[PDB]
Every structure is written in structure tokens, then in C-alpha cells.
Fold Complement C3.
Amino acid sequence: IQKSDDKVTLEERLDKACEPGVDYVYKTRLVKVQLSNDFDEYIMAIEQTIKSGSDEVQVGQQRTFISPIKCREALKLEEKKHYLMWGLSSDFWGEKPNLSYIIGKDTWVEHWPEEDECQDEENQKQCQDLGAFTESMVVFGCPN
């Protein structure tokens, strides 16, 4: 989703992440990046489950994000970083114990800076929006 992180507000995240099309909302980390000729895969671990969907995954379990190689320069996924990823349930690929996901055009990937990295003035607004995002969907959920 090519909306910029400065152009999106907290209320835009509240409107987009509470849609019934959007199935999963997670703040997570990634472990392994495997680069292949067909598609690049990301073994990725659950840090929090902000909004669980049709996949029953627990905190600390690992899943796989599949992206095409042309998005490898576009995603800019660096290892041991935190990312906010949401999206729809149409990106189911495998079966239930071996579920794989697809980074589609409707998949929201955002850089989540760390707790020390919130101390910068450039990352203050993003940390405030993402903290109020977590404190709105974890504690109170999504209305309608």
C-alpha cells in the first residue's frame, strides 16, 4: 500500500484497519530472509496479536511472508526490525498447519521504530500514532 507514513494519520489507520475485509493486524518482527529466483520469503515471528483473524497464531510462532523479487527493492525489509503488517484474508496460500501469506497490493507494511528510536523528533509522530493504534485496537477493538 503506497500511502506514505507521513501522509497517513492515526484516524486513517483506525479507518483502514477496522474494515471487515482486513482480517489480520499484527505488530511483529522478522527472523530470516531467504532470497530465491522465483520469490523472496520472510520467516517472521509474532511479537503481538493486535487483531487476530482466520489464522490462529500465537505470540512467538513463525510464519512466512512471500513476496516477488521485484518488491525486494520496494519493500526494503531489513533484518531484526519491527514492522506493522495488516491485510486481507485473500492472501491465504497453503493449508492450515503450513499457512503462507502473500504481500499483495492491499497489504500494509509500515516501519515500526524501536523504543529508543522513538526518542528522535522525526519518529515522534509515527511512535505516537502507532502507540495509539495499539492502545485503540488491543484494549477497545474495532467498532462496526
Q: What stands out?
A: The CA atoms of residues 24 and 52 lie 5 Å apart. Helices lie at 10-17, 72-75, 124-137. Residues 124-137 form the longest helix (14 residues).
